[PDB]
């Protein structure tokens, strides 16, 4: 009942973003304490957002909000679904060819064609539970093995830290068929998302006790370097499981359109230039969604306006604010 809903919520929240985020969230905070503080803030923000969606989605059942709705429909077809579809494939490409280049970083040509091949493969398969089980093993191994050896720039840290929490806005869509949402859906979120937050903190401290702070910057795949410095004899299981589970986490005209324009997103942009490109438009409409509810909320509004005015991107306002306004 309740534990089943909690497990379902935890399953759709812990994705392939917990071992890709720290490298980008530490390059902005440049510290350890502030990094954990930003991670806890992102966790509590996702918790509040999911708790608000649990009360906003079960009372109006695009469905939550004319012109704004049309804009959301138009944005979710180009810059939301296809962009996030390319980031997952770019993360899979930078992790399956990382152990091959030990001393130096992989070439940009190799990672792009490998990511494009991953896009065309799953787009063809989809046009015609094992990943989750193997994904939780690595998170459990790194945490357990980490404990046996233990006892402007602030906005980019949130962008990279919140990418690991990918799926907190679509929790009520796959949890309304379990039991009564009276005191089960908000209960499985107030203790399910913070459980992942404590899981992410216990997983991040496992990296800082093996490799120092300066080694995390010059390491594209932080999990493959943790797998050879601790589990030296069995070091191939880490880059294999996190790659076998990443490819799993990634309508004929909809899939083809989502795979064609996603290939042109990896040519002029790296894996770091796309996270701040997707989280900009995503959180821009997230703030409009919270603002629409007003017309938790006192904090969700003050933190959303800061996430937009701090960076103020130039190649984004001419696609969402100029592309369709000439069409409409």
């Amino acid at each position: 009942g309740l534990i089943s809903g909690i497990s379902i919520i935890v399953g759709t929240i812990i994705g392939s973003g917990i071992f890709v985020s720290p490298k980008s969230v530490l390059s902005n905070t440049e510290a350890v304490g502030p990094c954990l503080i930003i991670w806890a803030a992102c966790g509590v923000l996702a918790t509040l957002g999911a708790l608000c969606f649990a009360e906003l989605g079960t009372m109006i059942t695009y469905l939550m909000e004319p012109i704004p709705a049309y804009l959301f429909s138009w944005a979710s077809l180009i810059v939301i679904k296809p962009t996030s579809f390319a980031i997952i494939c770019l993360s899979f490409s930078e992790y399956v060819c990382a152990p091959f280049y030990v001393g130096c970083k992989p070439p940009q040509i190799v990672v792009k064609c490998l990511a494009a091949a991953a896009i065309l493969f799953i787009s063809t398969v989809n046009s015609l539970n094992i990943f989750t089980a193997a994904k939780l093993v690595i998170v459990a191994i790194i945490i357990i093995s980490g404990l046996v050896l233990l006892a402007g720039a602030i906005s980019l840290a949130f962008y990279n830290g919140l990418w690991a929490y990918d799926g907190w806005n679509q929790l009520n869509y796959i949890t309304e068929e379990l039991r009564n949402p009276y005191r089960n859906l908000p209960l499985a979120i107030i203790i399910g998302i913070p459980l992942v937050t404590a899981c992410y903190i216990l997983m991040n401290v496992s990296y800082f006790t093996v490799m120092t702070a300066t080694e995390l910057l010059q390491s594209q795949a932080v999990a493959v370097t943790f797998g050879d410095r601790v589990l030296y004899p069995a070091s191939w299981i880490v880059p294999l499981f996190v790659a076998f589970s990443t490819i799993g986490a990634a309508p004929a005209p909809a899939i083809i359109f989502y795979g064609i324009i996603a290939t042109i997103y990896i040519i002029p942009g790296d894996i770091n230039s796309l996270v701040n490109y997707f989280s900009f438009a995503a959180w821009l409409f997230y703030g409009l969604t919270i603002l629409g509810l007003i017309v938790i909320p006192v904090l969700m509004t003050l933190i959303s306006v800061f996430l937009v005015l701090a960076p103020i991107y130039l190649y984004c306002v001419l696609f969402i604010l100029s592309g369709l306004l000439f069409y409409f």
Binding site: Y101, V110, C113, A117, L120, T212, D228
Partner: protein
């Protein structure tokens, strides 16, 4: 069509991974800057340099694009000279700080992307060592830790078992009144050679290596490798003078050392040192370097430390050549370069160092005019350039002072403190009566003065390391030398797929003119210079037929052509490369097959 295009990409990626060569290790790319720990920088204001002073000046090391430090031996030693006789390998002397000061130095080095190397002397120990004090009393397993032999020692004088002489005096067998037996030292009266034929002793050295490897020293540098093992048969060595009377041979030069140097099984001990360090090199970025540093020997014996194609011994032996050369010319410099490239096995990484601790300074042995041209030769060679401390600028030797400590009078002129500022003691220390008098002409030669003025002999060292690190022709490229001359040394650095070569010209003569049309074919009417050994004519125009070169003058020419000398049939026996690869301009990646 897409179902065929998706695998054509996977086939392309698996081809790039299979054709990509192995990336150069940290010891192959980036120059080294050997630092003397006692004459670099002082912090606690005592008179002697310390490890904390090196941490304070770490930002200057990165300013020279230096990759590795290679700190000279810093241990608790009763003899600071003569191969650094150590009395405690696990502890540090009161000087150079404490163990905590060393841990903060290596940690700060890793934060700036630099690498560390420490000197290791497994050959001998000191008289005050806990192993030697326990060996004279025959206490436990330490009774055979040293080479002991029964000798006669009556009222007046001791008699050694053989005529084996030490490198620094007479009678390499000394008698002690506790054990009543002669011990083999071969270096000094207070430096007993550690017997390596004992399986216990060979394993005790492994514990010392693993002790520093856990600290993160990032490699070692062995000091005396050819003196490890000796002949078990205590027979007399062959004298150079056959008619010479015995009881008179007391010099290390008048004796053929066939039983005390390079014995059978000495390399196997060096092979075992790499096997121990290989356990800590399993990490992809944490590789361990090992240097042999075998000096005063022929070229065929030095290249034997490179190892065999089926067993790894060491990365590269330290190139003692180019340092003992006092008078440099076109033929002396060319012979040294060809002696190393022709004797070294292929696929290995060479190295070069102009000066060191046991050698005179560059400007004091060659002259102030050769400081600029020798620095270019160090960075234009395929090997790993190794730079002594204070060598980037022109630092002269000092006169021999009478120190109360047991130090070698000779080879001490190179231990002068580093000239940082123009303040008291050249900014080396704020204290008085330093351990060694700073060179007199420090008001005109220091890092602060040479940084503010242009056309100095400090910027040439900066952009040379930048050109060596940025350009790929100097990192991993072919080396094709042109014939032989007595007034100019010219060689070409090239690589497949670059479509551009580097022509380096060094004079080493007497202000002669060079005709480049007689050496290399296909050069245009005008060529541009890159750096020079004067920093005033860079980016100029010079025709090939007729180039004005001064005594201490050197040029680097950058020509665009696809007529590499390494492809011609004539330049096949004078072209060497370590990692043969091909460059691609369209796809910016490294290729093996091309």
């Amino acid at each position: 069509l897409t179902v065929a295009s998706v695998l054509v990409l996977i086939a392309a990626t698996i081809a790039i991974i299979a054709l990509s060569p192995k990336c150069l290790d940290w010891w192959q790319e980036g120059p080294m800057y050997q630092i003397y720990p006692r004459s670099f920088k002082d912090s606690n204001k005592d008179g002697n340099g310390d490890l904390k002073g090196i941490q304070d000046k770490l930002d200057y090391i990165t300013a020279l694009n230096i990759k590795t430090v290679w700190i000279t031996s810093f241990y608790k030693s009763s003899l600071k000279d003569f191969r650094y006789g150590v009395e405690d390998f696990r502890e540090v002397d009161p000087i150079f700080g404490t163990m905590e000061d060393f841990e903060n130095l290596v940690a700060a080095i890793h934060d700036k992307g630099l690498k560390l190397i420490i000197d290791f002397i497994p050959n001998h120990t000191s008289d005050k060592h806990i192993w030697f004090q326990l060996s004279r009393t025959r206490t436990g397993k330490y009774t055979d830790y040293y080479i002991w032999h029964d000798c006669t020692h009556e009222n007046g004088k001791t008699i050694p078992p053989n005529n084996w002489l030490s490198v620094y005096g007479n009678s390499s067998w000394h008698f002690d009144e506790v054990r009543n037996q002669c011990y083999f030292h071969q270096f000094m009266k207070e430096q007993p050679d550690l017997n390596f034929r004992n399986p216990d002793v060979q394993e005790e050295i492994k514990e010392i290596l693993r002790f520093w490897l856990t600290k993160g020293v990032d490699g070692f540098s062995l000091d005396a490798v050819k003196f490890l093992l000796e002949a078990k048969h205590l027979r007399d060595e062959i004298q150079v003078n056959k008619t010479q009377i015995p009881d008179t041979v007391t010099q290390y030069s008048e004796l053929y050392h066939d039983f005390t140097t390079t014995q059978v099984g000495m390399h196997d001990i060096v092979r075992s040192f790499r096997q121990t360090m290989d356990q800590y090199s399993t990490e992809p970025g944490r590789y361990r370097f090992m240097g042999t540093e075998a000096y005063a020997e022929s070229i065929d014996r030095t290249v034997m430390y490179y190892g065999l194609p089926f067993i790894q011994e060491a990365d590269f032996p330290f190139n003692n050549y180019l340092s003992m050369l006092d008078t440099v010319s076109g033929n002396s410099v060319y012979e040294v370069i060809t002696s190393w490239m022709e004797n070294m096995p292929e696929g290995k990484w060479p190295n070069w160092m102009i000066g060191g601790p046991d050698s005179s300074r560059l400007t004091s042995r060659l002259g102030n005019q050769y400081v600029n041209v020798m620095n270019m030769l160090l960075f234009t060679l395929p090997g790993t350039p190794i730079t002594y401390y204070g060598e980037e600028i022109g630092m002269g030797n000092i006169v021999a002072a009478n120190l109360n400590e047991s130090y070698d009078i000779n080879t001490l002129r190179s231990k002068s403190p580093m000239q940082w500022d123009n303040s008291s003691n050249a900014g080396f220390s704020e204290a008085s009566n330093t351990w060694l008098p700073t060179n007199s002409d420090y008001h005109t030669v220091n890092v602060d003065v040479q940084k503010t003025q242009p056309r100095s002999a400090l910027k040439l060292y900066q952009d040379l390391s930048l050109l060596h690190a940025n350009e790929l022709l100097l990192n991993r490229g072919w080396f094709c030398h042109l014939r032989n001359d007595s007034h100019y040394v010219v060689y070409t650095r090239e690589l497949d797929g670059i479509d551009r070569i580097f022509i380096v010209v060094l004079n080493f003569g007497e202000s002669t003119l060079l005709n480049l049309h007689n050496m290399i074919s296909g050069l245009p009417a005008k060529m541009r210079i890159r750096l020079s050994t004067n920093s005033a004519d860079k980016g100029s125009k010079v025709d090939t037929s007729g180039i004005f070169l001064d005594k201490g003058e050197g040029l680097i020419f950058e020509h665009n052509t696809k007529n590499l000398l390494h492809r011609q049939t004539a330049f096949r026996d004078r072209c060497f490369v370590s990692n043969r690869a091909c460059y691609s301009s369209v796809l910016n990646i490294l290729y093996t097959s091309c």
